Enzyme design. Sequence first.
Site, mmCIF file in Angstrom:
data_model
loop_
_atom_site.group_PDB
_atom_site.id
_atom_site.type_symbol
_atom_site.label_atom_id
_atom_site.label_comp_id
_atom_site.label_asym_id
_atom_site.label_seq_id
_atom_site.Cartn_x
_atom_site.Cartn_y
_atom_site.Cartn_z
ATOM 1 N N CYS A 110 2.824 5.165 -5.592
ATOM 2 C CA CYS A 110 1.772 4.203 -5.632
ATOM 3 C C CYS A 110 1.774 3.481 -7.073
ATOM 4 C CB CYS A 110 0.306 4.513 -5.352
ATOM 5 S SG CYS A 110 -0.588 3.294 -4.792
ATOM 6 N N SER A 123 -16.131 11.744 8.090
ATOM 7 C CA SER A 123 -15.626 11.282 6.972
ATOM 8 C C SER A 123 -16.418 11.810 5.948
ATOM 9 C CB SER A 123 -15.480 9.591 6.729
ATOM 10 O OG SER A 123 -14.680 9.396 5.724
ATOM 11 N N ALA A 124 -15.751 12.277 4.819
ATOM 12 C CA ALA A 124 -16.311 12.798 3.321
ATOM 13 C C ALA A 124 -17.372 11.915 2.942
ATOM 14 C CB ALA A 124 -15.409 13.201 2.455
ATOM 15 N N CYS A 140 2.646 -5.457 -0.844
ATOM 16 C CA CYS A 140 1.456 -5.328 -1.762
ATOM 17 C C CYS A 140 1.384 -6.382 -2.690
ATOM 18 C CB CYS A 140 2.040 -4.412 -3.008
ATOM 19 S SG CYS A 140 0.788 -3.045 -3.964
HETATM 20 C C1 FAD Z 1 -5.090 2.041 -6.487
HETATM 21 C C2 FAD Z 1 -4.354 1.472 -4.955
HETATM 22 C C3 FAD Z 1 -4.378 0.173 -4.636
HETATM 23 C C4 FAD Z 1 -3.688 -0.151 -3.404
HETATM 24 N N1 FAD Z 1 -3.334 -1.659 -3.232
HETATM 25 C C5 FAD Z 1 -3.121 -1.775 -2.102
HETATM 26 C C6 FAD Z 1 -2.468 -3.148 -1.569
HETATM 27 O O1 FAD Z 1 -2.662 -3.933 -2.729
HETATM 28 N N2 FAD Z 1 -2.058 -3.462 -0.606
HETATM 29 C C7 FAD Z 1 -1.682 -2.325 0.370
HETATM 30 O O2 FAD Z 1 -1.108 -2.814 1.405
HETATM 31 N N3 FAD Z 1 -1.925 -0.963 0.155
HETATM 32 C C8 FAD Z 1 -2.607 -0.738 -1.147
HETATM 33 N N4 FAD Z 1 -3.007 0.483 -1.428
HETATM 34 C C9 FAD Z 1 -2.339 1.693 -0.678
HETATM 35 C C10 FAD Z 1 -3.150 1.960 0.811
HETATM 36 O O3 FAD Z 1 -3.307 0.649 1.734
HETATM 37 C C11 FAD Z 1 -4.503 2.680 0.404
HETATM 38 O O4 FAD Z 1 -4.169 3.613 -0.127
HETATM 39 C C12 FAD Z 1 -5.208 2.849 1.788
HETATM 40 O O5 FAD Z 1 -6.588 3.129 1.661
HETATM 41 C C13 FAD Z 1 -4.593 3.957 2.613
HETATM 42 O O6 FAD Z 1 -5.579 4.149 3.651
HETATM 43 P P1 FAD Z 1 -5.268 5.454 4.192
HETATM 44 O O7 FAD Z 1 -6.405 5.426 5.682
HETATM 45 O O8 FAD Z 1 -4.129 6.329 4.725
HETATM 46 O O9 FAD Z 1 -6.481 6.508 3.380
HETATM 47 P P2 FAD Z 1 -7.718 6.344 2.619
HETATM 48 O O10 FAD Z 1 -8.027 4.731 2.587
HETATM 49 O O11 FAD Z 1 -7.799 6.679 1.291
HETATM 50 O O12 FAD Z 1 -8.774 6.790 3.607
HETATM 51 C C14 FAD Z 1 -8.736 8.452 3.811
HETATM 52 C C15 FAD Z 1 -10.210 8.620 4.199
HETATM 53 O O13 FAD Z 1 -10.272 10.059 4.634
HETATM 54 C C16 FAD Z 1 -11.440 10.681 3.855
HETATM 55 N N5 FAD Z 1 -10.978 12.104 4.043
HETATM 56 C C17 FAD Z 1 -10.327 12.730 2.892
HETATM 57 N N6 FAD Z 1 -10.426 13.828 3.257
HETATM 58 C C18 FAD Z 1 -11.328 14.376 4.208
HETATM 59 C C19 FAD Z 1 -12.105 15.463 4.991
HETATM 60 N N7 FAD Z 1 -11.424 16.702 4.617
HETATM 61 N N8 FAD Z 1 -12.689 15.299 5.919
HETATM 62 C C20 FAD Z 1 -13.371 14.141 6.208
HETATM 63 N N9 FAD Z 1 -12.751 13.065 5.680
HETATM 64 C C21 FAD Z 1 -11.909 13.139 4.490
HETATM 65 C C22 FAD Z 1 -11.547 9.838 2.615
HETATM 66 O O14 FAD Z 1 -12.944 10.015 2.063
HETATM 67 C C23 FAD Z 1 -11.265 8.433 2.957
HETATM 68 O O15 FAD Z 1 -12.224 7.922 3.685
HETATM 69 C C24 FAD Z 1 -3.286 0.754 -2.767
HETATM 70 C C25 FAD Z 1 -3.741 2.161 -2.981
HETATM 71 C C26 FAD Z 1 -4.146 2.475 -4.253
HETATM 72 C C27 FAD Z 1 -4.593 3.908 -4.610
HETATM 73 C C1 LMT Z 2 2.159 -6.392 -6.388
HETATM 74 C C2 LMT Z 2 3.074 -5.408 -6.782
HETATM 75 C C3 LMT Z 2 3.700 -5.531 -8.299
HETATM 76 C C4 LMT Z 2 3.044 -4.918 -9.268
HETATM 77 C C5 LMT Z 2 1.885 -5.441 -10.068
HETATM 78 C C6 LMT Z 2 1.806 -6.698 -10.793
HETATM 79 C C7 LMT Z 2 2.640 -6.755 -12.187
HETATM 80 C C8 LMT Z 2 2.092 -7.765 -13.243
HETATM 81 C C9 LMT Z 2 2.949 -9.125 -13.172
HETATM 82 C C10 LMT Z 2 3.738 -9.617 -14.360
HETATM 83 C C11 LMT Z 2 4.354 -10.839 -14.514
HETATM 84 C C12 LMT Z 2 3.838 -11.786 -15.638
HETATM 85 O O1 LMT Z 2 4.659 -12.832 -16.068
HETATM 86 C C13 LMT Z 2 4.800 -13.928 -15.384
HETATM 87 O O2 LMT Z 2 5.788 -13.981 -14.537
HETATM 88 C C14 LMT Z 2 6.385 -15.456 -13.925
HETATM 89 C C15 LMT Z 2 7.795 -15.381 -13.793
HETATM 90 O O3 LMT Z 2 8.476 -14.901 -12.921
HETATM 91 C C16 LMT Z 2 6.156 -16.410 -15.015
HETATM 92 O O4 LMT Z 2 5.728 -17.576 -13.777
HETATM 93 C C17 LMT Z 2 6.930 -18.323 -13.590
HETATM 94 O O5 LMT Z 2 7.302 -18.156 -12.244
HETATM 95 C C18 LMT Z 2 6.312 -18.961 -11.512
HETATM 96 C C19 LMT Z 2 6.146 -18.730 -10.066
HETATM 97 O O6 LMT Z 2 6.486 -17.519 -9.500
HETATM 98 C C20 LMT Z 2 5.944 -20.363 -12.025
HETATM 99 O O7 LMT Z 2 4.967 -20.799 -11.296
HETATM 100 C C21 LMT Z 2 5.727 -20.339 -13.431
HETATM 101 O O8 LMT Z 2 5.546 -21.881 -13.723
HETATM 102 C C22 LMT Z 2 6.793 -19.831 -14.228
HETATM 103 O O9 LMT Z 2 6.690 -19.888 -15.527
HETATM 104 C C23 LMT Z 2 4.800 -16.572 -15.699
HETATM 105 O O10 LMT Z 2 5.157 -17.320 -16.842
HETATM 106 C C24 LMT Z 2 5.097 -15.031 -16.329
HETATM 107 O O11 LMT Z 2 3.756 -15.208 -17.295
HETATM 108 S S H2S Z 3 2.889 -0.370 -4.587
HETATM 109 S S H2S Z 4 0.588 -1.665 -2.908
HETATM 110 S S H2S Z 5 0.376 2.025 -3.092
#
Ligand code: FAD
Ligand code: LMT
Ligand code: H2S
Ligand code: H2S
Ligand code: H2S
Lengths: 421, 421
Positions: free
Chosen positions: A163, A37-38, A359
């Site tokens: 993403c 890994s990098a 997510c």
């Molecule tokens: C900001 C963000 C939030 C996210 N949140 C969620 C979430 O809440 N839930 C969810 O399910 N998914 C989420 N994801 C998506 C996904 O789960 C992640 O992107 C996850 O890290 C992807 O896994 P991966 O193994 O494919 O790549 P990565 O985790 O990116 O791993 C790739 C690895 O390969 C290495 N590498 C790259 N090139 C080389 C090379 N040439 N030689 C050796 N090593 C190398 C890198 O250093 C890295 O360590 C999120 C993604 C992002 C960007």
């Molecule tokens: C995970 C992937 C999604 C993308 C990343 C995140 C985006 C940010 C989230 C914005 C939501 C904020 O807005 C919020 O929404 C819900 C409405 O559904 C409201 O909440 C409402 O539903 C919830 C249950 O789901 C109740 O518990 C609550 O009493 C009711 O008011 C909040 O009053 C409001 O403040």
């Molecule tokens: S996402």
């Molecule tokens: S995600």
């Molecule tokens: S993502």
Amino acid sequence: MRGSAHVVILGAGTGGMPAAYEMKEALGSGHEVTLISANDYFQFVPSNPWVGVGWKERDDIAFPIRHYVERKGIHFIAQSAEQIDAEAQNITLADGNTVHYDYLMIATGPKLAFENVPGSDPHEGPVQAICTVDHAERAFAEYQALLREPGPIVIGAMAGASCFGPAYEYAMIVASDLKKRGMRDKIPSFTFITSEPYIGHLGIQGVGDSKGILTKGLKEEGIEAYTNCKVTKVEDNKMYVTQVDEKGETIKEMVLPVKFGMMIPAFKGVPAVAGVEGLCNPGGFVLVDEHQRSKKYANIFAAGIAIAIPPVETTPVPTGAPKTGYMIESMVSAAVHNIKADLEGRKGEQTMGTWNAVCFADMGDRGAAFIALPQLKPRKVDVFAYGRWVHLAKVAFEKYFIRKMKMGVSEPFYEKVLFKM
Amino acid sequence: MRGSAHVVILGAGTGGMPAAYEMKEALGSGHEVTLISANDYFQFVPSNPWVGVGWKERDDIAFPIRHYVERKGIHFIAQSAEQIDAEAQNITLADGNTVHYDYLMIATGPKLAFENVPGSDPHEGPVQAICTVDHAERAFAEYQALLREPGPIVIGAMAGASCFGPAYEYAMIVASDLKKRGMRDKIPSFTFITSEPYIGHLGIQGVGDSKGILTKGLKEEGIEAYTNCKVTKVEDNKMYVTQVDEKGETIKEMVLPVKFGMMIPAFKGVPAVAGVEGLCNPGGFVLVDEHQRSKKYANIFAAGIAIAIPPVETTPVPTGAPKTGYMIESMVSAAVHNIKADLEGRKGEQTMGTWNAVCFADMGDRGAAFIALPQLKPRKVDVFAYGRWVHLAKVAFEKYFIRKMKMGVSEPFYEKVLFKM
Ligand SMILES: Cc1cc2nc3c(=O)[nH]c(=O)nc-3n(C[C@H](O)[C@H](O)[C@H](O)COP(=O)(O)OP(=O)(O)OC[C@H]3O[C@@H](n4cnc5c(N)ncnc54)[C@H](O)[C@@H]3O)c2cc1C
Ligand SMILES: CCCCCCCCCCCCO[C@@H]1O[C@H](CO)[C@@H](O[C@H]2O[C@H](CO)[C@@H](O)[C@H](O)[C@H]2O)[C@H](O)[C@H]1O
Ligand SMILES: [S]
Ligand SMILES: [S]
Ligand SMILES: [S]
Ligand SMILES: Cc1cc2nc3c(=O)[nH]c(=O)nc-3n(C[C@H](O)[C@H](O)[C@H](O)COP(=O)(O)OP(=O)(O)OC[C@H]3O[C@@H](n4cnc5c(N)ncnc54)[C@H](O)[C@@H]3O)c2cc1C
Ligand SMILES: CCCCCCCCCCCCO[C@@H]1O[C@H](CO)[C@@H](O[C@H]2O[C@H](CO)[C@@H](O)[C@H](O)[C@H]2O)[C@H](O)[C@H]1O
Ligand SMILES: [S]
Ligand SMILES: [S]
Ligand SMILES: [S]
Ligand SMILES: [S]
Ligand SMILES: [S]
Ligand SMILES: [S]
Ligand SMILES: [S]
């Protein structure tokens, strides 16, 4: 070597780290498993947005890899691969050393394609990014520079992004943090720019009431939002934005000043992988069959963001669908099982199973989460949820995943579905 | 790596090949054992003189290493090491790749120091050598060229040589072969030149009646013999020889024409080993303690011709004492045991035991052999023997050693002393 096949895992991230452990567990002492890994440290990617606003530190979300994998019998090389020769089955490392493999599992994740948008690289201008902890630390630094000297904010996702969740998450927690600092009233404009055809499309044609809830959430925070946008360039601290209609025709161009910005870039395959002749699609993503095996090389497997997954829709501005943690782990599990099967005669029949996206986003005291499957509507599960319990779950899963990455994994993974039994 | 130490064996010869097997056996599946060697094949060195006269073929005495060690879990690299960094614990290979080690066992055997005698390199003139199968094949080629065009023969051992048996052996079998071809009468002169102070000194101050028997054997074959000789240069197909007295004073110089020649060269340490600062004596031999551990680096061990053994006498012309198979195997056995002990806490106390020299030479239907121990007289065993049974034993041991090198070894070795029980 003959009878004792050498398996190399390329990339120590969400997929590759578990892949290393699972591979070693599955193969045992008679087979060498090498993790390359990098970086010398693992990072929990979903925590990066919080690092980007200062609610978390690198120390909380990252740790050095060597000791944890070595105590499991896994060899660790902390070097980037620069070249892969799939005929000779040699990997050339950054330092010039070469590593031979019998089987290769590619888990290199995404290349952040800043070059798609001239000026968008975090080191070239005010548009930062939070995909990696290095970049999120930098985003936070620049956030502090916005506090000392308020100006317009622009957050969102570039054309070709896949993403989107993190863009909404980051915008919400920035808005929130600004309030908690009494600084919110100091921002002349706070704008959300996305390549999505509508708010809450999320690269998956919406999920539950993502449209309504995200739309309302943005308005609630006084964030002005534009969809069907691409950024053509960042220059002189301005974002040049083009907005199109359903047919791709421009309906406006905008020039937005930016003091603080964060746009999720498009992902491509990393150069070392994309550079393997015939291995990848033009985006640099590895073309694999349902068993995670390369269609070209029978001894190359791939999992995670690195693999190609065909689009199922076409948006006015190009967008992609996310590849998320649960599906990545299923890909990993299938690859390990099918490699082992190759080593033992059989053809592995394991697949990653049904396409899904899952997510979880934490806003502070509560979070939003979605589950969507399969990819095309009408779905079997299409849920968007918001609650304090999403926050508790995110916190719980982060703690869990990091622990498992230190202590090792085997069997399957997740199956934290013991909260039922 | 930590907890799973990586052990590298450098050199796949009489000591190193068994060392690899024994190391892997001793350490097991939780430790990587890598065998690195300049050639991809093992060769049974004592058979080389016969190759040199055509009584044996390469195919009979050599075989490819890879399959046999790999099926035992040993990694094989068929590259020469060019540089050893003992601080970083990295070995740089001919191809530029580097190999890290936790423990290193040096078994690189001898550098054939042709450069001591300008013109003596087998590729520079008519003086050939039979220490390696490559050179013995070449010696034989040149022997056939002597048959087609008879001229003077000169066989013997250079100043600084430590391996004299093979010179006598080769001279005898050449004389013999010449007879069996009715070509003996065609040789104008057949001369034996040695740095030994007398015929049959053998670098060990004589053994049994080696003086009398070898002297008589040479005369029997019409071979004229000179002792206390050094060759100053080979040039224009002539050997320039200087003969000294007990005090080093010249008592004659001779210029000998050579159509066919074979002189055992002096041995030095190989450059990659000699090049390690502070590791070796000025001859390039690794300075080790009684446990085979380097005196400078606690994680470098050495065995075989590669180690330094202090002289116990000084001859008018510099000569060395031989390092022979049974003692080499004891060195190997001690090194493996003491490395294992290091890996498991203890300090290994195993030593190579009593100095001894054991040599068997086959003349065709019968052979000569000696056993001498310890190094200085009066000895506990000092025997020279000649008989058909020495021939049978040589044939038997060659077959045995080659078989064991294909099938693997462990425990100790030799102990073919089951011919008693
Ligand atoms: C900001 C963000 C939030 C996210 N949140 C969620 C979430 O809440 N839930 C969810 O399910 N998914 C989420 N994801 C998506 C996904 O789960 C992640 O992107 C996850 O890290 C992807 O896994 P991966 O193994 O494919 O790549 P990565 O985790 O990116 O791993 C790739 C690895 O390969 C290495 N590498 C790259 N090139 C080389 C090379 N040439 N030689 C050796 N090593 C190398 C890198 O250093 C890295 O360590 C999120 C993604 C992002 C960007
Ligand atoms: C995970 C992937 C999604 C993308 C990343 C995140 C985006 C940010 C989230 C914005 C939501 C904020 O807005 C919020 O929404 C819900 C409405 O559904 C409201 O909440 C409402 O539903 C919830 C249950 O789901 C109740 O518990 C609550 O009493 C009711 O008011 C909040 O009053 C409001 O403040
Ligand atoms: S996402
Ligand atoms: S995600
Ligand atoms: S993502
Ligand atoms: C002609 C002859 C006859 C002999 N007959 C007998 C006999 O009858 N009985 C007896 O007991 N002894 C005999 N010996 C002596 C001794 O037993 C042999 O010399 C034996 O081969 C020595 O073993 P070794 O492991 O120290 O070195 P070697 O067998 O020479 O092995 C050294 C190995 O290291 C490799 N190497 C060298 N440099 C490098 C490098 N930089 N990188 C990687 N690999 C390298 C070489 O290719 C070689 O494979 C004889 C010796 C000779 C020359
Ligand atoms: C192995 C290391 C030694 C160096 C390499 C080899 C050198 C070549 C050997 C030359 C010996 C030839 O000379 C040979 O010696 C012995 C005498 O001791 C004689 O043999 C004599 O003793 C043997 C037993 O040892 C009797 O079986 C035999 O009947 C008797 O004649 C042979 O008649 C003679 O031909
Ligand atoms: S990033
Ligand atoms: S749906
Ligand atoms: S030689
Ligand atoms: S020797
Ligand atoms: S010898
Ligand atoms: S020998
Ligand atoms: S002796």
